[PDB]
Each structure stands twice: as structure tokens, then as C-alpha cells.
């Protein structure tokens, strides 16, 4: 049948041109029944047509096609244990997804596929129903209803062929579990192929570690009960004898570095075979070769096994490739930060020979910077160059600025209000800026700070700070005096090493003191400064301005930032006065912390802490009485009331400025006082020493699910604080406050738990020793952040 024209009826999405091209028949050619059938089948196979009918009109060949309705949405209902996103991913992987059409005959196929997925995940009685909702313009919505049913769990895990080790011990190291006691959360009792493979690998590694090189897993069997509610797993294995590592031999194109590889391969003859050591030696050889430029030093190790003597000899083949040079270094994704910020953290230099360890170090430094979420590295090859490569870093940025405010309560502080704002990356330049303010029942504090990290190419940092403070000691568990100060500081910082840091700077401060009730130590200090106040009424004022030089060193080597298991930390700070200032003195403080694991799993651990501090004047003057040290509390020595250990106060018999009955006054001349009065009000001292030892245990009854957010420990802490200027001879009727041998000791227990709201801490201690004059407290509760 000759065809003069081609016409279509029902085309909505597919263009006429596409249909004409897909049709083997074209205008101006003879057509028979076979060609029409072929065209119909081609239209059906397009995947976008439901019904097709190619008939012949009077002169024109007319095709009626009913397009499959376009899928507009896919809804789900009954996916409790299956997330909607993953199910949609599976559906689109199968082929059905949004935008395509719906085949009105594959509903059963999709339902059975989803049922098979439910069978794989564990549920075997699941039912899936598909509902079709037509909508105008030949659209359709496919809804899915799921009856999950009941899942299945493992009822027994058995191993056959093992004699040296009990089955329970082996299962103890398996991810899959068969018993879940209510008092412990060890894991779910579901079955997964990935978990089974992990358990098999763990068993193989466990057997190999003991020298069972010939260990082989014969097979694994999984069975279900007739009710299909229980899973039984069996493993058939074969444990053999052990083997010894007779020696190691190396042969290959070592490139003249044979002398430096023998030391790495040294071993003790007769040592047990171990693959981890072989891998470590291969990695060490690769790193040694790469230190000289080579990028791909292929290394292969093959063991030769002699069963007669049960010996293993390792043959090492080394193929060192050619040197590779770096032509360019590219950064992408830094839409906010400028190029220099990322480029100054690099360890690999552009235009030099390649080293992979340097690239890894640069990636680690970028990750540590904290401005990005994810960091990836790629090493592309230059087209046509056999020894040229380019290094590309891909990063994703993160928000850095922050603003905070809040309220809190404290036993002695009362109601506290705090606020602040900070920006760690100012306009993508690296500058850091911050402002903070705080107010409680006895002090007000305002702080502003700016910092530039790279003041020099090497990495020296420069910072400045301004502060205003107004404090009263009325409710500070001390004597009474009001201070008002303001000052500024400038500092420079040097990264002397990877694990060490140094700081040096200058500072200026202005202080004003008022409301100084008559007392012994304060009057002694004022006399040393030259002032001559009377001992009759409390009315004084003292203004001073000081310039000081500050220095400090820090060493950090912890293995973690939270709940560390092994490491040490040391901090030292010091301050000196510059000539030309009213005051003249020096001050030094040191803190040390250390951790030590006991077992091989780093679980039972020991913690040690020490804190020391000393300062004094230089030119015969005295150190200010507002720079003294205080000991006693929940941070220095638990079991005692805050700021209790140390010398006490002594008041002159004096007349109060305004006496009001129904109250009490210390050594009041109006009341009839005529001699110095002893008391129990802490004043402080200019020398301190505190030590603490703690033993940290895993947990009483919690499981490995959340074993990284709780801690329990028993602590024993000792301390003391004293003043070295107290004159014992003149005042022989009061304790000796210049004796550094009245060490307080205490012991107790503590528990800590990280919570989404804050780090809740509880502790209970009982001071088995305490000198007279000091109070004591038992329970410490910390609920919230700062």
C-alpha cells in the first residue's frame, strides 16, 4: 500500500518528528500488514504508549494512540521500618519514577518487587497494594499501601568445627546477636548479609591473629522455621596448625635504596606469622620510596609455606615507577573565602616533585581549619605528559558567625544574665572578632577582642583586647571591698612546633578600690604602698595604673577532644610589671593534666592533675591583695565549700560608719570591742598547690550503644594555699598562716553524662580530714552549660 501522507492522533508529549523517525515506514513507500505490525510494535516498545491502532483511511494511514498517563506523584502509606527516601530510590532504580508514564499491566510486577525487597530486609509476610488515581490531562497518581506484618529474628548462632575457642567467645565479637537482655543494649536481633560477612571476616581475623594461617571457612547455612519467625545460622570451618615466619627476602628495582630497606625488614627468627606486620612493612617501604619523589611504588608480598617444618618465608617484589611532578594546585568551592586563606595551609609546593603524605597533611589541615564541612582530594593526569599531575581540592563551606544569650541561676551568684556575639571569619579574610557581656548579683563584665592569625608569612598571629570590669566581694565568700577596673592588652603568638605554642604581649590596666573595711592584711599592704589610713571607720579610696608584660607556653598532645583516653597537657602563664608603674610584682601559674590507660582496650583509665601558682613583689613593695590565690571548690578540691582553704581574716576593733541594731558586726568598737577578733572569712594567699588522682571505670550497667557519653570515677584530691608574708612573731594568738604543711585531703565518687541540653555532672565526696575553721559540703550538681 503506497503511502502519500502520515498522520497521528493522540500525540501529547512525543513530537511528530520523533515518532516519524522511530517508524521504519516513511511517507512515499509501499506498506503491507507486516510493516504496520512492526510499526505498532515499535510504538508499543517506546514505553510511552498504552494502546496503538494503525488503520487505513480512504487515502491516509491513521494511527490512534492512547498515551500512558504521565506519573505526577508517588505516595506511600505503611512504611514504618522503611524510610520513604530509600524506597523512592529503589523505585526509581527499578525504572518507575516521576515524569515518566505508568504501565497499567506492571502493577503486579512492582508489587512483587516491593514484596521481594521486604523479604530481603527481613519481613516475609508483607503485603503491597498499588492504587491508581487518574487525573485530567491524562495524568495519574500511583499510591502504595504496605502491610509490613511481623519481622523475624535470630534464635540461635552455632559454630561447628571449633575446638580451641568456645563458641560464646567467638560470638562475643560478632555484630549479629542472638540474646538481648533487658538490662543491656548490645544490638538488634535482625539478620543482614552485610553483618554476616562482617562476622565471618572478624572470625577469620581472630583465627589468623593466633597463628592459624590454615584457617578456612567450609561454608555457611541459614535456615528459617516453618512459621518463618526464627532464623538459624550455622558455620562450618576447619582450624589447622600454626606457622612460623622463617625470614624475608627482597628483590626488585630498589633504585639503590637496598641498604635502607633491610632495617625495615628485620625480624626475630621464629616469630609468629602476621599479615598486619607485612602490610605495615609494605606501607613503610612505600613511604620511604615516596620521600624521594616516586608516586606509585608498587609492592607485592608472597608467602612460601613449608608444611614439613611449618615455616613461612616472605618474598617481596618492589617496582618503583617514575617521578611525578606537580604542575598546578586548584581550589574549588571557596565562594566566600579568598584564595590565600586556603592556599597558605598547603604543604605541597606547586612546581616541585610530588609527595602523597604532603597532600594528606594539607587535607588534614584544611579539615582542622573549621570553615568547611567536607574535604576531598583528587590527583588528575596531564593529557600527554607521562610524569605531570594536578592536585585538586573540593570543599564545602560552613557558617561561622554566632550569637548567644541566656540566663542562669547559682547558689552564690544568684541570677545571672549573659550575652555575646562572635565572627570567626570576617568577610572571608581570617580575622576573628568577638564581643561579650555578663552580669550577676555581684559583678559586671564587658569584653571586646580582635585577632589576625597571619601577621607574618610564617604564621605569627597578632591580637588585641579591651575589657571593663566592676566587682564586689560582698557575696564572694571573702572580705568586703569594691573594685572597678578597665584595661587593654596586645599579644603576639608563635607556633614554635606542632605540639607547642608560645605567646608574648603587653597590657595596661587601671584600678580603683573603695569600701575597704579595717583589716590586718589590707592595711599592711596599704602601709607598704605608703598610704596611711586610720583604723576607726571604713571609708577609703585607692586608684592605680599599671603596665605589664605577659608571657605563656602551651603543650597539647591529647588523643581526643572529648573523653580522652591517653595523653597529656601542660600550660604555663606568667606576668611581670614594667618600671614606671605604681605597683611592681611578678606572678606565675602552671597547670598539668595526664591520662594513662590500663587495659588493652583503653577502657579502665587513670587521671592525674596538678596545679601550682606563686607570685610576689620586687622592689620591697607588696603584691596587690586583689591578685591573691584561692583554693577550695568543685574545680580544685571537692568536699569543701567554695574558697574556704587558706588564711582567715582578722579585724581591728573599729566603729562602723552606720550601726543598725538587729544585725551583727565584726569587732565593733561601738559594741565594746577592744582586741583583735579572729574569724573564718577566707582572704587568700600568694602561694598555692593542688593535686588530684582519679580512677575512671567503664560503667555500672549500660551497654556499648551509648558507652561514649557517660563516665564514672572515684577521686582522691589534696590541696593547700598559704601566704608567705604573715608575721607570726607579732601575732602569737592566732594560727600560723605561713606554714605550708596543712594539706587538706578528701575522697569521693563522681559521674558525668553528656546530654543534648548540657553536660550534666553529679558528685558526692566526704572529706575524711579537715583542719578547724573550714566548712564542708557533700553533693555537687552541675546542670547546664557555663
Amino acid at each position: 500500500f503506497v503511502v502519500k501522507d502520515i498522520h497521528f492522533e493522540g500525540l501529547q508529549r512525543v513530537a511528530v518528528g520523533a515518532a516519524l523517525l522511530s517508524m521504519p515506514v516513511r511517507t512515499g513507500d509501499t506498506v503491507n500488514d507486516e510493516d504496520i505490525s512492526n510499526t505498532i510494535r515499535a510504538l508499543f516498545a517506546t514505553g510511552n504508549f498504552e494502546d496503538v491502532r494503525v488503520l487505513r483511511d480512504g487515502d491516509t494511514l491513521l494511527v490512534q494512540v492512547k498515551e500512558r498517563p504521565t506519573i505526577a506523584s508517588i505516595t506511600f502509606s505503611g512504611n514504618k521500618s522503611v524510610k520513604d527516601d530509600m524506597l523512592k530510590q529503589n523505585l526509581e532504580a527499578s525504572g518507575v519514577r516521576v515524569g515518566e508514564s505508568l504501565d497499567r499491566t506492571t502493577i503486579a510486577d512492582i508489587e512483587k518487587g516491593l514484596e521481594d525487597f521486604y523479604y530481603s530486609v527481613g519481613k516475609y509476610s508483607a503485603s503491597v497494594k498499588a492504587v491508581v488515581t487518574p487525573l485530567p490531562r491524562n495524568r495519574v497518581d500511583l499510591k502504595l499501601v504496605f502491610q509490613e506484618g511481623v519481622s523475624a529474628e535470630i534464635q540461635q548462632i552455632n559454630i561447628v568445627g571449633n575446638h580451641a575457642f568456645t563458641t560464646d567467645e567467638l560470638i562475643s565479637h560478632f555484630q549479629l546477636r542472638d540474646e538481648v537482655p533487658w538490662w543491656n543494649v548490645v544490638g538488634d536481633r535482625k539478620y543482614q548479609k552485610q553483618k554476616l560477612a562482617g562476622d565471618l571476616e572478624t572470625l577469620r581475623s581472630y583465627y589468623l591473629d593466633r597463628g592459624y594461617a590454615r584457617f578456612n571457612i567450609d561454608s555457611t547455612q541459614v535456615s528459617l522455621t516453618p512459621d518463618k519467625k526464627g532464623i538459624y545460622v550455622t558455620v562450618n570451618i576447619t582450624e589447622g596448625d600454626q606457622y612460623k615466619l622463617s625470614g624475608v627476602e627482597v628483590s626488585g628495582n630498589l633504585a639503590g635504596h637496598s641498604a635502607e630497606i633491610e632495617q625495615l625488614t628485620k625480624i626475630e627468627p621464629g616469630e609468629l606469622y602476621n599479615g598486619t606486620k607485612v602490610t605495615k612493612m609494605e606501607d613503610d617501604i612505600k613511604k620511604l620510596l615516596g620521600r624521594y619523589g616516586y608516586a606509585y611504588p608498587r609492592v607485592q608480598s608472597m608467602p612460601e609455606i613449608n608444611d614439613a617444618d611449618k615455616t613461612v618465608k616472605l618474598r617481596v617484589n618492589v617496582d618503583a615507577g617514575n617521578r611525578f611532578y606537580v604542575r598546578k594546585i586548584r581550589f574549588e568551592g571557596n565562594d566566600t573565602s579568598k584564595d590565600a586563606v586556603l592556599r597558605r595551609e598547603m604543604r605541597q609546593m606547586e612546581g616541585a616533585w610530588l609527595g602523597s603524605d604532603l597532600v594528606d597533611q594539607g587535607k588534614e589541615r584544611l579539615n582542622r581549619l573549621g570553615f568547611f564541612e567536607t574535604v576531598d582530594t583528587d590527583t588528575q593526569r596531564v593529557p600527554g605528559s607521562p610524569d605531570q599531575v594536578d592536585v585538586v581540592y573540593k570543599v564545602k563551606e560552613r557558617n561561622t558567625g554566632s550569637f548567644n544569650f541566656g540566663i542562669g541561676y547559682g547558689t552564690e551568684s544568684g541570677v545571672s544574665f549573659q550575652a555575646g556575639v562572635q565572627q570567626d571569619n570576617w568577610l572571608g579574610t581570617g580575622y576573628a572578632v568577638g564581643i561579650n557581656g555578663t552580669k550577676n548579683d555581684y559583678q559586671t563584665y564587658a569584653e571586646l577582642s580582635v585577632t589576625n592569625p597571619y601577621f607574618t608569612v610564617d604564621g605569627v598571629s597578632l591580637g588585641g583586647r579591651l575589657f571593663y570590669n566592676d566587682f564586689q566581694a560582698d557575696d564572694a565568700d571573702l572580705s568586703d571591698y569594691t573594685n572597678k577596673s578597665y584595661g587593654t592588652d596586645v599579644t603576639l603568638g608563635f607556633p614554635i612546633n606542632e605540639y607547642n605554642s608560645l605567646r608574648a604581649g603587653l597590657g595596661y590596666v587601671h584600678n580603683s578600690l573603695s569600701n575597704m573595711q579595717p583589716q590586718v592584711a589590707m592595711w599592711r599592704y596599704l602601709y607598704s604602698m605608703g598610704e596611711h589610713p586610720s583604723t576607726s571607720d571604713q571609708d577609703n579610696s585607692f586608684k592605680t595604673d599599671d603596665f605589664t608584660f605577659n608571657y605563656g607556653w602551651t603543650y597539647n598532645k591529647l588523643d581526643r577532644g572529648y573523653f580522652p583516653t591517653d595523653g597529656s597537657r601542660v600550660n604555663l602563664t606568667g606576668k611581670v610589671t614594667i618600671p614606671g608603674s605604681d605597683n611592681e610584682y611578678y606572678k606565675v601559674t602552671l597547670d598539668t593534666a595526664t591520662y594513662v590507660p590500663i587495659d588493652d582496650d583503653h577502657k579502665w583509665v587513670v587521671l592525674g592533675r596538678t596545679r601550682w601558682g606563686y607570685g610576689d613583689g620586687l622592689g620591697g613593695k607588696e603584691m596587690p591583695f586583689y591578685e591573691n590565690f584561692y583554693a577550695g571548690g568543685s574545680s580544685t578540691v571537692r568536699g569543701f565549700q567554695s574558697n574556704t582553704i587558706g588564711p582567715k581574716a582578722v579585724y581591728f576593733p573599729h566603729q562602723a560608719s552606720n550601726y543598725d541594731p538587729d544585725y551583727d558586726y565584726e569587732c565593733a568598737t561601738q559594741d565594746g570591742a577592744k582586741d583583735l577578733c579572729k574569724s573564718d572569712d577566707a582572704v587568700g594567699g600568694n602561694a598555692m598547690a593542688v593535686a588530684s588522682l582519679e580512677f575512671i571505670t567503664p560503667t555500672p550497667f549500660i551497654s556499648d550503644k551509648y558507652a561514649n557519653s557517660v563516665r564514672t570515677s572515684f577521686f582522691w584530691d589534696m590541696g593547700t594555699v598559704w601566704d608567705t608574708n604573715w608575721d607570726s612573731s607579732q601575732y602569737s594568738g592566732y594560727p600560723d598562716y605561713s606554714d605550708p604543711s596543712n594539706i587538706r585531703m578528701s575522697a569521693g565518687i563522681a559521674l558525668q553524662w553528656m546530654s543534648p541540653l548540657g553536660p550534666l555532672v553529679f558528685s558526692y565526696a566526704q572529706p575524711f580530714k579537715k583542719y578547724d575553721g573550714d566548712k564542708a559540703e557533700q553533693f555537687q550538681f552541675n546542670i547546664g552549660k557555663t
Binding site: 557558617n399 548567644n404 544569650f405
Partner: peptide, 12 residues
């Protein structure tokens, strides 16, 4: 001793 705080932080 009842040291406590309820502070919120909001990134900006």
C-alpha cells in the same frame, strides 16, 4: 551547690 544555666545559641 546548684550552678545552672539555660543558654541558647543560634548560628547567623
Amino acid at each position: 551547690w546548684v550552678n545552672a544555666f539555660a543558654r541558647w545559641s543560634k548560628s547567623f
